[PDB]
Amino acid sequence: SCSYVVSRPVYSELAFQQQYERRVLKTLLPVLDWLPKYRIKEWLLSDIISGVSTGLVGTLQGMAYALLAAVPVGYGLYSAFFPILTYFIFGTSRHISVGPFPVVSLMVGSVVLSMAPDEHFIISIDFAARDAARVLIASTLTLLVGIIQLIFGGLQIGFIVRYLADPLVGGFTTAAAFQVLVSQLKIVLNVSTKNYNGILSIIYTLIEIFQNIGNTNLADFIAGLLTIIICMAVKELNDRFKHKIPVPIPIEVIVTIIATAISYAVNLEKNYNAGIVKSIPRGFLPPEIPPISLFSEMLTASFSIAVVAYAIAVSVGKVYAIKYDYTIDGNQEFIAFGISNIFSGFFSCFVATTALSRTAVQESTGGKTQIAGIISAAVVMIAIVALGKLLEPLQKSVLAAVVIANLKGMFMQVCDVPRLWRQNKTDAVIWVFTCIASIILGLDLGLLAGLMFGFLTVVVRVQFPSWNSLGSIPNTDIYRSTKDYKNIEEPEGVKILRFSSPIFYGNVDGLKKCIKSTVGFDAIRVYNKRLKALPIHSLVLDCGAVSFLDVVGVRSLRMIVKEFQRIDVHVYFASLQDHVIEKLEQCGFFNDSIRKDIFFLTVHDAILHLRSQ
Amino acid sequence: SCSYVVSRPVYSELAFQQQYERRVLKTLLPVLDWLPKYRIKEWLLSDIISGVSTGLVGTLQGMAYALLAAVPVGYGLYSAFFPILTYFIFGTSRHISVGPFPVVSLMVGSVVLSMAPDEHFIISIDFAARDAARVLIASTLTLLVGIIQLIFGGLQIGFIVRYLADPLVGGFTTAAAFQVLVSQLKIVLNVSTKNYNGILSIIYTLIEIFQNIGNTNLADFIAGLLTIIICMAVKELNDRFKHKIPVPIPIEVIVTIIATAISYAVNLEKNYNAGIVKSIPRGFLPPEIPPISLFSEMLTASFSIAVVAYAIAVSVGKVYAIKYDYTIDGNQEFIAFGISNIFSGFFSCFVATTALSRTAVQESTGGKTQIAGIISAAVVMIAIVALGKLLEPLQKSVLAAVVIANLKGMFMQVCDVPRLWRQNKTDAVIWVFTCIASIILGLDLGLLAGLMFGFLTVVVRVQFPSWNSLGSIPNTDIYRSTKDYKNIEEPEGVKILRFSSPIFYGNVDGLKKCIKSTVGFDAIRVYNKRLKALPIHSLVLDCGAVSFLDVVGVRSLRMIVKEFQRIDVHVYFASLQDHVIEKLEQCGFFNDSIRKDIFFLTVHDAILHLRSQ
Ligand SMILES: CCCCCCCCCCC(CCCCCCCCCC)(CO[C@@H]1O[C@H](CO)[C@@H](O[C@H]2O[C@H](CO)[C@@H](O)[C@H](O)[C@H]2O)[C@H](O)[C@H]1O)CO[C@@H]1O[C@H](CO)[C@@H](O[C@H]2O[C@H](CO)[C@@H](O)[C@H](O)[C@H]2O)[C@H](O)[C@H]1O
Ligand SMILES: CCCCCCCCCCC(CCCCCCCCCC)(CO[C@@H]1O[C@H](CO)[C@@H](O[C@H]2O[C@H](CO)[C@@H](O)[C@H](O)[C@H]2O)[C@H](O)[C@H]1O)CO[C@@H]1O[C@H](CO)[C@@H](O[C@H]2O[C@H](CO)[C@@H](O)[C@H](O)[C@H]2O)[C@H](O)[C@H]1O
Ligand SMILES: CCCCCCCCCCO[C@@H]1O[C@H](CO)[C@@H](O[C@H]2O[C@H](CO)[C@@H](O)[C@H](O)[C@H]2O)[C@H](O)[C@H]1O
Ligand SMILES: CCCCCCCCCCO[C@@H]1O[C@H](CO)[C@@H](O[C@H]2O[C@H](CO)[C@@H](O)[C@H](O)[C@H]2O)[C@H](O)[C@H]1O
Ligand SMILES: CC(C)CCC[C@@H](C)[C@H]1CC[C@H]2[C@@H]3CC=C4C[C@@H](O)CC[C@]4(C)[C@H]3CC[C@]12C
Ligand SMILES: CC(C)CCC[C@@H](C)[C@H]1CC[C@H]2[C@@H]3CC=C4C[C@@H](O)CC[C@]4(C)[C@H]3CC[C@]12C
Ligand SMILES: CC(C)CCC[C@@H](C)[C@H]1CC[C@H]2[C@@H]3CC=C4C[C@@H](O)CC[C@]4(C)[C@H]3CC[C@]12C
Ligand SMILES: CC(C)CCC[C@@H](C)[C@H]1CC[C@H]2[C@@H]3CC=C4C[C@@H](O)CC[C@]4(C)[C@H]3CC[C@]12C
Ligand SMILES: CC(C)CCC[C@@H](C)[C@H]1CC[C@H]2[C@@H]3CC=C4C[C@@H](O)CC[C@]4(C)[C@H]3CC[C@]12C
Ligand SMILES: CC(C)CCC[C@@H](C)[C@H]1CC[C@H]2[C@@H]3CC=C4C[C@@H](O)CC[C@]4(C)[C@H]3CC[C@]12C
Ligand SMILES: CC(C)CCC[C@@H](C)[C@H]1CC[C@H]2[C@@H]3CC=C4C[C@@H](O)CC[C@]4(C)[C@H]3CC[C@]12C
Ligand SMILES: CC(C)CCC[C@@H](C)[C@H]1CC[C@H]2[C@@H]3CC=C4C[C@@H](O)CC[C@]4(C)[C@H]3CC[C@]12C
């Protein structure tokens, strides 16, 4: 077939260089960008239907997620209402539903419980004062998270979600599922448990729950178990019998309606001492300014919460945008969600993001634009203004059971952990480390630990690279490892070393050790022995994979060259890139008789030049 | 001259692979390793002289460094005595002098002051109880540091000192010099200042010192100023007039002797209210067991102290070992210094390492083995037993002035900062960040921040690499950037992209963006447009610099190949290494019609194969 025939002079860097010579409206994203281009002729009906469905789902979702935060039920409605209104303007995505999320709500509740415990705040029980303090703390945290997100949007650093690798995301997801399950199991059993803040809090909480298991309430446990069983059975049936009924069945809404109707009919509050919400405010509360003096105690938590919420939002937005053929601006997502969280924090709400289960419901029912979001917000308004009194008999175990039933998809990643281990060990290590760290520590500290562990893994992989001793395939220009191909001939009196990594301080010491191993000696010892008295004459360094270089690497290379030239051993460099040669030039490498004459384009010019002498 | 002539078939990976087929006594280092091989015939006299000189220096150094720790003078003698005895056995280096170091002592003193302040401990002044508590805390910290160092020696992780890059070491050195100068200036002026623990403590200390500057003592200030001037003048004269008097002049010992003799003669204590040591114990105190219950409050400090002390020790040891033609074991250095610090902590001592000035004094006077360490320990013992009473009149301002005079070499690195900026910007950024973060956060937190920042810099440099679009030099096999050489011809209907970095998640998104920019489009949009309806036909990826690869990178490459094959655009890979191909194989890449047939050895086989079709 085709043949490889090339005729050219043996080119050094100097010869090659002397023959061939070198050398305002999008930031505040308007609705005016797509409202004037609306298609009300056919989009309006689908938008209305989707908005009604997703509002019905989101009212219950907000009420349930208000329990994960240490906030009385009723502010979850505000958290499901206000962010949608303030995101309708600045939002890029046209398919996501804005509101609470079980993991972000759990993080917020952990912070709120830490800063306002029952025993520390009250020594009288003063439920009203405690609830007011918890609401204030949640609002302050939401405002801080919004400020951080807006600042990140201003700096246009939207690539940080790249650092959230899939293995650490999976580990954090599994740990968050465990945390949410423990909290909601505490709620379901109607068992009191003093809050634990700090390290290994989940283990202490589980121990105390299992100690007090003898004080469980029968009615709440039965309601939670039945809700979980019904919801999971319906989900499984819909998933298996999926060709018909394309849209998911809103089983949670039906279960909640039936449960609250039965509770009203039987009056479970007094006859069985059941735990009901017992209080939902009527109407809208006036806005209040949160106390910013707490900002110094909520930095390591607000940073993690902002990162996680933005990551979930952009993940869902991208998943639907690639499906519907459009693009989302990450910096604009920062800006929109930061404004949303600031607005929410000024109106007694906890942190807002998107949810995959709610977005799927909104999209599958015919979502076109964010008009469905406005319809959902209107439904939440109707629930707040009028439906407040009819949700009083509802039990909290029903909402906790809904959350527990939904936790399955998050719990199902230990299944693909082993495949990840089989493919790449580093990714499995990252997964396990992130999960364990988020279990031993909190979620906010676990996320930071996982991120920095990923950074360490990258640094370590760069630091300990693959290196080889090379020899030529006969009658070709192909050089491979001598100990791998069994037909490789080492050239006469010259060793070729390939160090497949950029050279920096860790790589500096690694490279010195590798050179000493490959050439069979070191220049310092032989030079000292020769001075006291008073096999290889050339070494080629294949530098085709040296991506970058620093001052320490340049100094190391200079010292290597000088030490080998002391004992009359020549050092040549091959396949160095142009920018690395520029870095060598600007770091003072080409001083004291180097002159760029020991550089060749590939590892065949060096060997041919060696044969000349 | 020589010519590049090669004739061979156009080799793909499959064709090449089917044609050429692949495939107990040192740990407890004895003195018995070198004592039986002693050369007492001529080494003994030089060892004795060097030991006497370095013991005279080290007694004063220990007394001076005992002030940097919040410990009464007298335990510095123990810290200069015990570690030498316990290092004489396990030590590898034969030229270093073991004892206190100003930066490590300052770190210990900061911890001790934080855990035992004057106002918190005493509300009576109870100097004896405060001193006892400070000594206990220092001993506990020393024991913890020794435990950590011994554990690190057991794990044989001695390469961690690689992570201490030269720029961050220089920045930390300058910050530590500033901290030591502030503390010793507080001591010299005889001005009381309430201790500050936390963030920006140095600024508050300086502000209060300048506020109380009106309460300075004249005698102490004059003594300190004269000592500083005399010491620095003698050092500069010796450095300039260096051809004669090869050994350094022990000006500090002479100054201290003269100052204490004058203080005894004039009795400066009562006539001028001067600040003298006033108390030096007679003899040796019995050992005591430190309270380990404090270990939970000294982790982030003990880790940094251990790292810094070991780094200084190995640095000095290597500097002298390369000079005298021998090698030092890093893990054995961990083991020796961990045992030394445990032994010191059990005997009321603070953390021990080596000092460059003391080591230079010991070596320049004919140091041969670690017998000069034993002689120095004997001199310190003589000073403890007998010379305790004659050092009572000595002022503390003299010792603080000695430390301040020695701080010049550490202060003299801001001069080399700008050259580092001119050569490599990342190294200068690391230097400045490490300097700044150790003044705001302190030394122990500053070191960790600098290490983290170095890891982030490495990750960022890997994440944003150099990428190019390649074309061939005519009548050769040389491919260079099209926009650089002005004689580069792009081939017919094919683009060649070089991405010079290993491919991971950050590099995954970077690579997708780079491919989209280079080919002028993306496969998803054109495929969707073509489906709605119902310039380049090949893309070569030069992967000669892809050092490693993970699961995310493999998935990204698979998706890129599939998306481009959807629109009848062929994707070829060239210059991939064998281990990266193995990683692709074990990550499931070669499934669903890939078959390793689109891989070529260099970027000339791919273009020749393209010309065939
Ligand atoms: C972008 C990249 C990431 C950025 C991350 C930013 C993190 C910022 C941390 C800020 C920080 C350290 C500052 C120095 C950090 C040095 C790090 C060096 C790292 C080197 C590699 C501030 O440190 C000081 O803390 C004081 C309290 O101790 C606080 O309050 C004092 O003054 C007040 C008046 O000002 C006065 O009202 C108050 O009374 C005073 O006490 C001070 O204002 C504050 O300055 C630590 O504070 C953070 O908040 C909490 C504090 O308790 C703490 O919460 C945890 O509690 C649970 C257990 O209970 C735990 O289980 C949870 O997890 C978590 O809820 C956090 O953990 C901690 O982090
Ligand atoms: C190998 C690689 C490196 C390893 C580094 C290891 C660091 C270990 C830190 C340990 C740690 C966090 C644990 C979780 C860390 C999570 C990190 C996540 C990072 C994600 C990227 C323990 O946290 C808890 O702290 C409690 C005290 O708050 C302590 O005491 C409690 O229980 C006791 C009875 O057990 C009881 O007697 C006691 O009364 C209780 O209070 C607990 O025992 C302890 O568990 C923090 O403690 C460290 O020590 C100090 C504490 O005060 C603190 O000192 C600083 O003070 C100055 C200002 O005053 C400051 O200016 C200085 O700098 C520094 O002197 C340190 O700063 C802090 O770090
Ligand atoms: C990019 C790098 C980011 C690094 C972020 C580092 C964040 C850590 C700040 C200080 O560490 C925390 O300080 C808290 C101070 O309150 C401790 O809580 C403590 O609170 C109580 C009071 O101190 C103790 O009794 C409890 O044991 C303990 O939970 C907590 O354990 C500890 O982790
Ligand atoms: C490998 C990763 C290593 C990560 C290491 C992280 C170290 C941080 C742990 C907790 O952080 C510290 O906690 C102290 C708890 O005491 C704070 O001191 C505080 O002590 C007083 C009491 O809380 C406050 O009033 C002061 O403002 C403040 O200095 C201190 O500021 C804060 O940094
Ligand atoms: C759609 C589903 C979730 C509706 C749930 C309705 C709830 C309120 C109903 C369903 C099953 C009921 C329980 C069934 C059996 C008993 C045992 C009896 O000795 C006391 C009442 C008690 C404990 C009931 C309490 C109320 C209960 C929990
Ligand atoms: C709240 C408590 C119970 C949470 C406990 C979480 C820890 C213990 C769990 C969560 C996920 C688990 C991992 C999931 C999958 C595998 C692969 C298989 O080889 C078994 C071990 C291993 C590696 C598991 C080890 C234990 C693990 C890390
Ligand atoms: C190692 C290979 C062969 C496992 C193959 C089956 C995998 C998918 C399944 C089978 C049994 C599973 C384990 C069963 C029980 C537990 C305990 C709990 O903490 C959850 C994780 C963990 C540890 C599971 C991890 C995933 C697991 C190991
Ligand atoms: C990759 C890097 C960033 C990971 C760093 C994780 C470090 C800082 C964490 C992980 C687990 C943590 C430990 C978990 C439990 C305890 C027990 C407690 O009584 C004192 C703190 C101590 C001893 C913690 C110290 C800090 C610690 C060691
Ligand atoms: C105790 C307090 C006052 C110490 C303050 C130390 C800080 C402010 C000092 C220490 C070293 C200094 C740097 C040393 C050298 C240079 C290069 C030149 O271009 C001036 C700026 C720059 C980059 C300096 C900036 C300020 C700096 C970082
Ligand atoms: C920028 C180039 C031209 C500077 C060349 C001279 C260098 C070596 C010298 C000249 C003047 C010096 C600066 C003078 C004053 C200060 C303030 C103090 O905090 C020490 C560092 C710093 C910031 C010095 C750093 C080093 C410095 C910048
Ligand atoms: C030949 C070139 C390198 C000379 C540069 C000028 C040198 C001699 C001068 C210029 C500015 C000076 C610095 C100015 C300020 C300070 C802060 C002080 O607390 C310690 C000394 C220190 C750090 C000085 C050291 C010496 C210095 C760097
Ligand atoms: C390279 C990376 C990991 C370095 C990270 C350093 C971070 C954690 C440090 C550097 C400087 C620090 C800040 C310095 C000063 C203050 C003021 C104080 O009242 C609250 C804490 C706060 C706001 C600190 C928060 C943590 C901080 C931002």
Side-chain angles (χ1 to χ4, degrees), chain A residues 197-199 300 445 448:
Chain A
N197 55 3
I199 315 303
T300 195
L445 290 184
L448 302 180

Side-chain angles (χ1 to χ4, degrees), chain A residues 53-258:
Chain A
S53 296
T54 190
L56 272 181
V57 171
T59 294
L60 181 80
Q61 288 211 321
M63 260 190 291
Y65 299 160
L67 287 179
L68 280 161
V71 176
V73 171
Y75 299 91
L77 301 173
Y78 306 153
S79 308
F81 176 70
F82 287 107
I84 302 182
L85 294 180
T86 187
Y87 180 87
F88 172 79
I89 292 170
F90 302 86
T92 67
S93 165
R94 294 179 293 173
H95 289 105
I96 64 159
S97 199
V98 182
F101 194 71
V103 180
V104 181
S105 297
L106 176 84
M107 288 174 93
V108 167
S110 177
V111 162
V112 168
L113 277 179
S114 169
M115 293 177 70
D118 186 74
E119 58 92 20
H120 179 272
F121 191 83
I122 305 164
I123 55 175
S124 305
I125 188 66
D126 207 357
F127 278 146
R130 193 197 60 173
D131 282 2
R134 302 250 183 101
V135 168
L136 288 175
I137 293 176
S139 304
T140 314
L141 179 65
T142 311
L143 175 78
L144 186 53
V145 163
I147 277 159
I148 292 188
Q149 276 174 341
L150 184 59
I151 275 170
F152 276 13
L155 292 179
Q156 303 213 126
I157 47 168
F159 53 85
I160 46 172
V161 291
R162 295 172 190 190
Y163 297 131
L164 292 173
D166 287 301
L168 64 85
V169 162
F172 176 79
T173 297
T174 311
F178 269 117
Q179 298 291 323
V180 169
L181 165 73
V182 159
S183 196
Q184 296 307 275
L185 180 65
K186 194 163 115 166
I187 289 174
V188 167
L189 298 181
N190 207 345
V191 162
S192 297
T193 295
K194 60 167 173 289
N195 83 255
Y196 297 96
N197 55 3
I199 315 303
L200 275 298
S201 67
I202 184 169
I203 293 301
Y204 303 147
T205 300
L206 211 48
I207 289 183
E208 207 170 81
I209 285 168
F210 274 86
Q211 263 168 8
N212 308 348
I213 193 66
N215 290 318
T216 187
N217 196 309
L218 183 64
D220 305 338
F221 174 59
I222 297 298
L225 191 47
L226 286 175
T227 295
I228 280 157
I229 290 171
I230 288 160
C231 281
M232 293 177 71
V234 167
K235 281 167 191 333
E236 292 289 328
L237 287 192
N238 206 304
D239 271 332
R240 286 185 64 184
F241 176 55
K242 210 182 68 172
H243 55 94
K244 275 216 278 183
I245 318 170
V247 309
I249 289 295
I251 188 52
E252 291 98 2
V253 172
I254 300 167
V255 166
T256 288
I257 283 184
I258 294 170

Side-chain angles (χ1 to χ4, degrees), chain B residues 417-577:
Chain B
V417 179
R419 184 216 66 232
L420 194 63
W421 169 260
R422 272 193 300 273
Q423 291 178 341
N424 196 15
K425 282 169 190 178
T426 304
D427 292 283
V429 171
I430 292 168
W431 199 106
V432 172
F433 185 92
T434 318
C435 194
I436 296 297
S438 297
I439 295 165
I440 285 157
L441 297 163
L443 293 187
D444 59 340
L445 290 184
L447 186 74
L448 301 181
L451 288 157
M452 295 296 172
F453 193 74
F455 295 154
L456 276 296
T457 54
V458 171
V459 166
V460 163
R461 264 176 301 187
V462 174
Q463 187 201 8
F464 294 103
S466 166
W467 59 278
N468 278 315
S469 179
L470 301 194
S472 178
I473 291 287
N475 298 294
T476 44
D477 51 344
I478 301 162
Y479 287 71
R480 296 292 186 186
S481 178
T482 317
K483 65 182 178 62
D484 290 332
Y485 282 79
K486 307 296 115 178
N487 211 349
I488 289 291
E489 46 188 42
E490 317 203 46
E492 158 81 9
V494 56
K495 307 286 264 198
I496 308 156
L497 178 69
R498 196 187 146 86
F499 194 75
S500 303
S501 184
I503 297 175
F504 70 109
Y505 54 87
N507 272 340
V508 165
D509 291 331
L511 181 64
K512 293 187 286 185
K513 187 269 183 182
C514 289
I515 289 165
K516 181 179 182 293
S517 167
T518 295
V519 309
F521 61 92
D522 65 311
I524 298 89
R525 298 292 183 184
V526 292
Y527 185 54
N528 284 342
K529 270 198 64 172
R530 289 173 62 186
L531 262 182
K532 180 170 70 177
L534 296 194
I536 287 311
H537 77 102
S538 310
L539 168 82
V540 178
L541 289 183
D542 180 15
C543 308
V546 179
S547 311
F548 65 85
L549 197 63
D550 53 18
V551 291
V552 180
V554 173
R555 292 176 201 153
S556 185
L557 294 176
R558 211 191 299 121
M559 295 298 102
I560 282 155
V561 169
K562 300 291 179 67
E563 291 165 320
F564 272 109
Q565 288 189 354
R566 290 180 191 274
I567 51 155
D568 303 327
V569 177
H570 305 102
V571 172
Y572 303 97
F573 298 86
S575 290
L576 269 171
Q577 281 295 101

Side-chain angles (χ1 to χ4, degrees), chain A residues 547-562:
Chain A
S547 310
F548 65 85
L549 197 63
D550 53 18
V551 291
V552 180
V554 173
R555 292 176 201 153
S556 185
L557 293 176
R558 211 191 299 121
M559 295 298 102
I560 282 155
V561 169
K562 300 291 179 67

Side-chain angles (χ1 to χ4, degrees), chain A residues 281-302:
Chain A
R282 276 69 174 174
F284 291 93
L285 307 180
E288 294 293 328
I289 292 192
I292 63 170
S293 77
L294 321 167
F295 276 4
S296 64
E297 303 163 52
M298 294 182 286
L299 286 159
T300 195
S302 60

